[PDB]
């Protein structure tokens, strides 16, 4: 996105490129929205919840067994929210394909700009 | 590794806002006005190296460059308790104490006159930054120095760092009051032009909306510029909260901008701050939805909204607030793309006393900002049609031959308005 | 969602009544004069969102807009101990500091002059309201502002908010005292016209009845404006009891009105209050006192020719009330025929039991207010029409109307108002009659 929005300033002087610039900025903005939302979900729906579980448990822990169980619960909550199960594998693959497509779009945009 | 950001404070208003910003940051991080870490702030979780440098005397020095065409504000900063906060090598002051005379063209010529001092400072800071993320130019579009020189600096940052983001905090003049600067509409048009064409992200600071917020929400009868700048400093602290508190996501300004500016030409960002004076996620969002708390004068739909909530927040209350916001359709999104509404939970700074366990900032991209650019264009056209205050412009190089720089600024701001409307359109 | 009511205080009298209303609400909620909730009032069981707004500082701010074309009352509110309770941005003052001068035409022209500012304010409050229920305009029907500006605001609210209720509390001038406004009958007729055609409910506040109450029940010789405003504030506080004390049924004014007003034009409500004074009161004793003419707060002419009747009665009984005593009171009222009802419909008599404000001192373990729609209000409308006809037939006090645009060419709006008020009197008498269904 940085390259998009800098190069569309550089190449604004030539109007021929503007359609490419705009279409790339749109695709990149869609990707940016998705990634930002998904990271906010992982941070709060995975990390925030798992850390709150861990901290509440440890802060009410009276036994070492209790501490161990609390740490396991923290990690389990993080895994569950982060789609770390053996049943989320398809959604994980889709996430990974989206990542790889975003890298590909980056490469294609850099090629177009070159 | 640090991700340094250089703050450029331009003209009287920019320098005063930078000074109050540094005071607010010091207060939020528990840093004294001299740059010394307070004993209560020795164990802070904030990354100071991003925005401050540490001197050999344990002084934290702002990565701030103060440029003004008038001596009054620079002298006030150097005579303030925060004089030791700024790195002295990063301060350029024009020896030509004539200022821009509230003339945008004069401010541009002054930026050219002080180019070497300013670009020497910028280059020194760039080489002195381990991982400079970018530059934030804080200036006003309506003055002479801050407007003309601000547009010049936006251009020069775009030229010097054409692969680096250039963000501006551009103060838009009050559209409802008669500007004391008869050329103010020209300055405003030139600044809107530079934000639309040469900036990756323009934070619109509408003096009309800021005054309205300061009066209606802070209970300031006749809100002073000082109270508005205190709100601005609160906003700047909230904007740096993701830098000061290490999180898992969106820990950099690059990521913020990429989340905020989906259209490179449509790079005008609206800001929102709260409190303007036990808040639940839902109660916060309900108060945020009140028009009196939006910090952008937009004449339209929201493209995206990010609420950064700092303090002790129940994530389940955040989720409930998001669910209620969705059910209530509290934000209108672009029809040609998915509605980007994010909520980040962050902790508040431990060093700033907060009467409120939780504060929140809303950043909203809303197409009515095009109406603000249209208003600025109309003010420019109102001045140009009267040839008002042009005798001083013809003395300045940008206006020496013709007023084409004003007309181009009006065109650029029109293009910005039209792009904002297209972004309002599928 | 809250069901917000915006209180619009118009002119000297409206603004003073609004100020006393805000004082009463503050006292009922334990809110300081600065709008801050008192420490002792944090645990109230009342739903404030219906009638108050909450400021960001945990201050409860009245959902009240104070609009005046004369500075005296707005300045009095901003100079009162409650000045900090109200949002200063909710105070509109006409730059034309001429007021309506007790002239309906001048008040109307002023409403026209401040139309945009007023509807901008109303829309700002509507957007600041999650589920705004409506606006209550506190004005006088006999003055200039409350009559003229009240009619203007009623028209503009009806046009701009055609799905929102516009209720008015219109204070009628004292009929027993010589009005200083020789055109007062014209102003009253015009206000009655606007209440009849463009208002959903007009609460008639007769200064004659207020004087009668002050003499007979409070033993106030020559009641001062402060004592009148204290009575008004008592009534306004009583009006919010169904909102302030959570019950199972009829907890909102909309539902109350829909239960009380089967005929949209027959929206003139009479009030009665008890005790009115400077033993455990039973429900039956309460209802008997309410049925006592000395406790009715409306000056209706005792026309011996028209057998006036109640269309509807609501008895709001505030305090520690035994429902078995309520049932006994209903039985005794029925057996004694203590109320005459409209002949064309069943006697709608409801009784709501409510709790008193924990923050407001109640000298009476039990109080009661009666709100009654009673055809003898027609005697008031007939009197207003007759006074209008007396001035118009004599063209008395018309020079100031002819100076105003609404009356500059002719008085046809006054004559239509006089016709409407005559029709209102006759319709109220018919509503006292079994033929009311065919009266219109």
mmCIF file with all atom_site columns, C-alpha atoms in Angstrom, chain C residues 12 28 40 151-152 181 234 309 316 362 376 406-407 427:
data_model
loop_
_atom_site.group_PDB
_atom_site.id
_atom_site.type_symbol
_atom_site.label_atom_id
_atom_site.label_alt_id
_atom_site.label_comp_id
_atom_site.label_asym_id
_atom_site.label_entity_id
_atom_site.label_seq_id
_atom_site.pdbx_PDB_ins_code
_atom_site.Cartn_x
_atom_site.Cartn_y
_atom_site.Cartn_z
_atom_site.occupancy
_atom_site.B_iso_or_equiv
_atom_site.pdbx_formal_charge
_atom_site.auth_seq_id
_atom_site.auth_comp_id
_atom_site.auth_asym_id
_atom_site.auth_atom_id
_atom_site.pdbx_PDB_model_num
ATOM 1  C CA . UNK C 1 12  ? -41.272 34.811 30.502 1.00 0.00 ? 12  UNK C CA 1
ATOM 2  C CA . UNK C 1 28  ? -36.813 14.325 42.436 1.00 0.00 ? 28  UNK C CA 1
ATOM 3  C CA . UNK C 1 40  ? -26.996 10.469 48.149 1.00 0.00 ? 40  UNK C CA 1
ATOM 4  C CA . UNK C 1 151 ? -48.694 28.576 17.332 1.00 0.00 ? 151 UNK C CA 1
ATOM 5  C CA . UNK C 1 152 ? -45.691 29.094 15.051 1.00 0.00 ? 152 UNK C CA 1
ATOM 6  C CA . UNK C 1 181 ? -53.603 43.026 26.908 1.00 0.00 ? 181 UNK C CA 1
ATOM 7  C CA . UNK C 1 234 ? -45.486 20.176 41.599 1.00 0.00 ? 234 UNK C CA 1
ATOM 8  C CA . UNK C 1 309 ? -69.136 15.518 32.272 1.00 0.00 ? 309 UNK C CA 1
ATOM 9  C CA . UNK C 1 316 ? -52.117 9.679  40.086 1.00 0.00 ? 316 UNK C CA 1
ATOM 10 C CA . UNK C 1 362 ? -43.359 14.771 50.702 1.00 0.00 ? 362 UNK C CA 1
ATOM 11 C CA . UNK C 1 376 ? -66.882 22.243 31.420 1.00 0.00 ? 376 UNK C CA 1
ATOM 12 C CA . UNK C 1 406 ? -50.469 37.929 10.369 1.00 0.00 ? 406 UNK C CA 1
ATOM 13 C CA . UNK C 1 407 ? -53.035 40.670 11.101 1.00 0.00 ? 407 UNK C CA 1
ATOM 14 C CA . UNK C 1 427 ? -68.041 20.102 20.901 1.00 0.00 ? 427 UNK C CA 1
#
